[PDB]
Amino acid sequence: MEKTHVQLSLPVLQVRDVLVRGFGDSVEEVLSEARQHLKDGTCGLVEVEKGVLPQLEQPYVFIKRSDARTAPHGHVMVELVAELEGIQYGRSGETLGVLVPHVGEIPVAYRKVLLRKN
Numbered sequence: 630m631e632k633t634h635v636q637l638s639l640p641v642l643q644v645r646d647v648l649v650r651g652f653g654d655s656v657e658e659v660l661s662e663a664r665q666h667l668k669d670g671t672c673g674l675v676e677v678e679k680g681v682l683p684q685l686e687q688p689y690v691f692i693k694r695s696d697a698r699t700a701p702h703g704h705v706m707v708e709l710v711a712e713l714e715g716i717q718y719g720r721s722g723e724t725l726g727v728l729v730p731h732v733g734e735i736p737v738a739y740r741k742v743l744l745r746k747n
C-alpha cells in the first residue's frame with residue numbers, strides 16, 4: 630500500500646557535523662537502512678564537494694535525480710543508488726547528495742525531494 634513516491638523535506642548537514650557517517654556494511658544493508666531512516670524521519674543529506682566522500686563511510690547511498698520534468702509541488706524526483714569500491718548499484722541522473730543517519734545535528738538548509746520508494 631506504499632505509494633510509489635513520497636514528498637520529503639530532508640535536513641542538509643555539514644560533513645564535519647555528522648556523527649554516524651554511514652548506514653552499514655554492505656550494499657543491501659545501506660539501501661535498507663536508508664529507506665527505514667527516510668520512513669522514520671531520521672535521514673539527512675550531505676552535499677558532495679571535494680573532501681566530502683573521504684570523510685564518510687562506504688558503502689555510500691546517494692540520491693540522484695530520476696527525471697527532467699517532474700518537480701511536482703517544488704520537490705525534485707529522486708531515487709537511491711549505492712556505491713561500494715567504485716561500483717554503483719542502480720543507474721540514475723545527477724547526484725543531489727549522500728544520505729546519512731540524522732541524530733539531531735543542526736542542518737544548514739532543507740532539500741525538498743519526491744523520493745521513489747523501491
Ligand SMILES: Nc1nc2ccc(Br)cc2s1
Nearest residue numbers: 631635664667668746747
Ligand atoms: N520500502 C520502503 N522504502 C521507503 C523509503 C522511504 C520512505 Br519515507 C518509506 C519507505 S518504505
